């Protein structure tokens with residue numbers, strides 16, 4: 001069921017990333033833009049570009065009728081959602097199907113199983129996947145939370161079932177703080193996502209965050225493309241990602257891959273997706289959630305595996321079979337550094353016009369960016385400049401390679417996190433892999 | 444070996460190769476020292492260097508060819524080794540000996556091995572004694588115009604006259620008939636005198652519609668020699684390379700295996716240390732013949748890097764420090780790689796287009812390498828070297844690499860000067876290229 005033309009329902013670096021793969025496969029790449037993004041670089045490269053609305057950028061790109069009408073006028077027979085925006089919108093996936101447009105991504109059934117994080121955990125217990133101890137499904141309210149927290153033991157973390165981007169979570173150390181924390185997370189979740197359902201889990205001290213990339217196809221096969229360590233986090237936001245996660249010994253790594261493949265087959269998962277785990281000092285691992293879409297840091301997995309994940313997403317959507325797991329060879333080490341237009345100490349946005357742009361290059365350096373000299377970055381809305389990705393034979397060489405690349409990135413007119421990443425590459429804790437999700441919080 | 448450890452390297456070169464060398468040197472943790480003439484003060488790699496020495500007056504590319512200035516730069520910067528790149532001093536035997544005199548490691552082969560292969564007519568003789576096939580021709584240099592006449596009849600027309608000290612494609616004349624021979628001999632002999640100070644000519648049979656295939660080798664100080672596969676560089680304009688690729692799909696595995704073993708045998712026969720390239724021509728029956736060896740890194744090395752996973756310059760440096768190369772068995776050749784040379788010349792006429800680059804946006808993406816030192820606002824002196832950069836892609840097979848080249852080329856946006864981008868885009872769409880029906884003369888009959 002060949003796809004001939006694909007509309008990219010997204011913007012920024014992922015639009016350009018997708019465009020490149022789409023055009024290499026000989027398919028047509030259709031782009032959309034709000035009036036704010038009319039200077040976007042990939043608009044120059046696309047087979048057609050459709051203006052989909054007002055520069056309330058967040059808005060227009062979420063305007064389902066506009067995206068649909070663009071697919072139809074442009075005669076796209078498929079939509080690639082990327083990440084953010086409409087990629088996890090169940091209503092969009094259904095609507096696409098009603099217009100006989102192929103959503104590249106999983107079925108609504110699977111997306112629905114994992115969309116509420118407390119239920120997702122129950123679905124995983126049924127599949128025999130380890131989860132953090134906590135509430136069994138959602139909390140009835142602040143008084144069920146008090147009861148539960150005493151049984152589990154403090155500290156605990158309250159989490160929004162409908163939560164994302166680290167919003168709607170509160171770590172609670174003593175019972176005397178609980179009620180306040182509950183209602184603070186409830187309010188934030190209510191306003192942010194329209195759903196204030198909370199669940200509770202044990203708060204793991206200094207966990208490593210480790211995720212497994214899978215892709216599933218229409219025949220029930222599911223492969224893994226290795227695991228990524230995303231522990232270097234500021235305020236629960238990922239700054240630096242790596243594959244493989246060297247913390248893991250071979251045996252644990254195999255357990256984790258197998259666990260993730262099993263979870264995917266259990267829910268009928270098709271397309272690209274990621275299972276996130278927390279790993280404690282025991283090297284015990286716990287499922288915390290599944291992302292039902294491609295993620296920002298997928299490039300790290302591409303450089304160790306030699307797979308084009310977006311190409312596989314497209315082939316799976318066309319009815320093709322994935323390659324055998326035995327053909328996937330993971331090699332060497334890959335690091336990604338997110339370059340954003342923020343001050344490297346405060347992480348406060350730094351919008352403005354780029355007056356000089358000289359991106360790094362070289363063997364096994366991949367700068368994923370839609371930016372260029374004279375481009376204006378609207379940092380309030382997407383401070384992302386680009387992802388700097390390197391690959392080497394081992395971790396030390398990847399770190400040395402990343403530092404040379406970062407040094408070669410020349411950007412004027414705005415501040416960037418470049419200096420944050422450079423000082424991280426030189427930080428003995430980073431070099432020695434002695435850190436965790438709260439490392440930045442205590443430095 | 445630990446006493447032979449290199450801490451600091453001076454790059455006696457300019458342009459894209461200075462930048463390419465700089466990156467590898469700094470990733471290894473050694474100091475990269477750059478040099479520049481006054482016309483190159485705006486060069487991008489001078490901002491990335493640990494130190495930069497101005498070595499003289501621009502106009503004369505002489506400053507890069509000024510040995511005292513280069514040695515003085517190395518000594519003021521406390522460089523313990525010099526990386527020569529290609530062109531310039533990379534094949535200057537006197538500069539090599541001078542380096543050893545000042546206790547500076549020259550990253551490249553010994554003066555002996557370089558001397559053995561430097562006269563192209565004598566090199567063929569060395570290859571024959573090593574049991575390497577060569578093209579029938581003169582046995583050493585021709586005595587002169589009359590010896591050429593007699594010999595061309597023996598070996599049969601057409602023949603090609605070649606300057607023993609030749610390079611760049613200068614000092615060569617194809618001769619199809621005896622009537623043209625004498626005039627051709629003198630035209631080439633005098634060009635060769637002007638260009639090289641040596642007029643020595645040799646002769647070989649002119650292969651019709653040849654494919655140009657070369658093998659990349661690296662040798663170490665232990666006598667180990669590895670290959671990094673072979674490259675097809677057949678798409679030439681006036682004997683100049685424009686597009687290179689690896690592997691050469693023209694070949695079957697048995698011929699590929701024989702060509703690899705021949706290159707390995709040749710390098711051992713001459714005790715070759717460092718990166719080097721063996722050049723062959725391949726005729727209609729898939730027989731191959733040595734035409735020359737390049738005792739240095741070449742421009743198109745990146746193609747072999749992408750199919751093999753080897754940083755060739757990194758290996759060069761390890762070799763200079765006394766390390767052993769990896770085993771042949773550990774070298775895995777995979778997929779397919781293509782390189783397009785982007786130059787500041789009109790895509791139709793190939794006439795230089797000097798000027799300021801007012802817009803520069805390079806391609807990128809998975810398995811795409813733009814090797815370039817240019818940037819927006821840079822001025823390209825195309826009269827002096829018109830290289831903007833090399834665009835190199837890799838993919839799982841040839842057709843996929845060609846489709847990737849087209850997308851990468853489409854995304855290369857340059858303004859203010861003309862480039863060969865359109866030449867390359869039209870080659871990627873040319874059915875003869877896709878079908879692998881071309882040769883060194885294809886562009887000439889089109």
Ligand SMILES: Nc1ncnc2c1ncn2[C@@H]1O[C@H](COP(=O)(O)OP(=O)(O)NP(=O)(O)O)[C@@H](O)[C@H]1O
Nearest residue numbers: 132163164165166167201202203204209236288437
């Ligand atoms: N039970 C836990 N114990 C310790 N740390 C946790 C726990 N749960 C979450 N965290 C931390 O909070 C981060 C994010 O949690 P997560 O469940 O992924 O929420 P989120 O808001 O969906 N994340 P995201 O939308 O992808 O940015 C994790 O990466 C951990 O660093």
Ligand SMILES: Nc1ncnc2c1ncn2[C@@H]1O[C@H](COP(=O)(O)OP(=O)(O)NP(=O)(O)O)[C@@H](O)[C@H]1O
Nearest residue numbers: 603609610611612613647648649650655682734883
């Ligand atoms: N015997 C031959 N028969 C047919 N073509 C030949 C022959 N010898 C050389 N050529 C052609 O001329 C090109 C260059 O020959 P070469 O001997 O490498 O001279 P050159 O000036 O040293 N090369 P270079 O300096 O590296 O650009 C070859 O690639 C062939 O296209």
Ligand SMILES: C[As](C)(=O)[O-]
Nearest residue numbers: 115116161162163
């Ligand atoms: C993005 As959600 C917490 O509704 O799966």
Ligand SMILES: C[As](C)(=O)[O-]
Nearest residue numbers: 560561607608609
């Ligand atoms: C001196 As020579 C013909 O080997 O470049």
Ligand SMILES: [Ca+2]
Nearest residue numbers: 163164165289
């Ligand atoms: Ca999430």
Ligand SMILES: [Ca+2]
Nearest residue numbers: 165276289291
């Ligand atoms: Ca998460």
Ligand SMILES: [Ca+2]
Nearest residue numbers: 609610611735
């Ligand atoms: Ca030559």
Ligand SMILES: [Ca+2]
Nearest residue numbers: 722734735737
């Ligand atoms: Ca040659």
